[PDB]
Structure 1
Amino acid sequence: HHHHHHMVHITLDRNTANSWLIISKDRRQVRMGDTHQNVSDNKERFSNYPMVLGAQRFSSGKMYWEVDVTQKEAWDLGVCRDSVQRKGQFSLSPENGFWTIWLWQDSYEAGTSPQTTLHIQVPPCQIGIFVDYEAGVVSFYNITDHGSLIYTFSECVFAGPLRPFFNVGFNYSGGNAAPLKLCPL
């Protein structure tokens, strides 16, 4: 791909974070804490899962960013509607306003309903996310493998403003404490 020149500076929105997350001072890194992080509850926070949104809202144009997933066992990445459900249980699907891929139990899958098997020969340490709002496209690129395509959602019904979406995953195993990091342009 040649999408790097629509690069946008993404930062994380503390107010949307699950109350166990720790966001860095620069708002470019997030990890799971070993406890509640001593913040008040609010209607924006994802309650059930270790999720957080980007601060940026997009309703037009082409946007690209990169995320470091080094030494994680589990994570979700992509974009979602600004109006997604925050509280209780839900599935990551375009019907619920999410365009995502994930790693879980040594397999990579796209968040369709039901989920789609991905075929990645080189396990990625960094993921590129490309959104074309007018075209209705969300694409995922393997930066570790010369930018090779991972998955494309097309004919997307965004149905409102979009926000960058992140899930650092649980750490039941003690093997998933590593952060998600937004990579420099």
Structure 2
Amino acid sequence: GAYNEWKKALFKPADVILDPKTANPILLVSEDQRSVQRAKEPQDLPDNPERFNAHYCVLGCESFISGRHYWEVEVGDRKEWHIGVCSKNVQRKGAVKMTPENGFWTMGLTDGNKYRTLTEPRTNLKLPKPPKKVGVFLDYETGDISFYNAVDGSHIHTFLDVSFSEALYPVFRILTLEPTALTICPALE
């Protein structure tokens, strides 16, 4: 239907590779760099400038300054996750609040069934069908970051008409210990 036909007509499928150099030491990025899990305890890693040292986040390797791009994320039945995009120059050392003011445009799930945007004030999102796969859509020039249920195509949230002035990375955050990983669909190609 509309979602499938639209994504294919208009957005370039991004091949998102999770970047281990960015990941907080509490995260474990899979071998193929397509999945991330949250570990019990932090790994011993470099404190290189790219690495988030407080927020439990990882970025894709590739950033964008133009165009229409999408990727789909298999969240499955994981009870907590937040995903979206963030500016290249976000504060990576120390924990700043994850909001659009601070360069993050993200939504997600907390506490098993509370869907929300990471904004001030928060928008609580009523999803009586829980998504298992989420499509993330970037239109850099219009400034719209959209989230869809990637199975039934229903719209979840859009951040509308942002004037981006930095490169944008895919971002993924998982706070809790859960058996289901967060998985990037490759769609490639």
Q: 1:89 aligns with which of 90, 95, 99?
A: 95
The AA in structure 1 aligned to 2:117 is A
State how many pairs are aligned.
180
Q: What CA deviation, in whole Å up to 9, does each residue of 1:12-68 have, x standing for no partner?
A: 111110012111111100101122223222222111222100001100000000001
- What are the within-5 Å matches in structure 2 for residues 14-25 of structure 1? 14-25=20-31
- 1:168 and 1:147 map into 2 onto residues whose CA distance is 24
SS of corresponding position for 2:21 = helix
Letter in 2 for 1:143: A
Q: CA deviation at 1:83?
A: 0.4
Paired letter, 2:171? F
Paired residues of 1:77 and 1:166 also in contact (CA < 8 A): yes
Name 2:107's counterpart in structure 1.
101
Equivalences for residues 146-185 of structure 1 within 5 A: 146-171=152-177, 176-185=178-187
Preserved CA contact (<8 Å) 2:133 2:150: yes
Q: 2:135 aligns with which of 128, 135, 139?
A: 128
Query: Matched residue of 2:72: which SS?
Result: strand
Which structure 1 residue ranges, 4+ long, deviate > 4 Å from structure 2?
A: none
Secondary structure of 1:38 counterpart? coil
Q: Is the partner of 1:16 in helix, strand or coil?
A: coil
Q: Hey, what's the Cα distance between the residues in 2 that align with 1:48 and 1:136?
A: 28
Work out whether 1:50 is the aligned partner of 2:56. yes
Residue-by-residue CA offset, 1:104-129 (whole Å, 9 max, x unaligned): 12210012211111121210111000
Q: Percent identity?
A: 41
After TM superposition, the score normalised by the length of structure 2 is 0.90
| Aligned position for 1:3 | 7
1:71 to partner: Cα distance: 2.4
8 Å Cα contact 2:16-2:186 kept in structure 1: no
The within-5 A match list for 1:136-147 is 136-144=143-151, 146-147=152-153
Equivalent residue, structure 2, for 1:112: 119
1:38 corresponds, among 44, 59, 68, to 44
**Deviation at residue 84 of structure 1 after TM alignment:** 0.5
Q: Which residue of 2 aligns with 1:64?
A: 70
Q: Where in structure 2 are there 5+ consecutive unaligned residues?
A: none
Task: Give the partner amino acid of 1:111.
Answer: L
Q: Normalising to structure 1: TM-score of the pair?
A: 0.92
Distance in 1 between residues matched to 2:100 and 2:45, nearest whole Å: 31
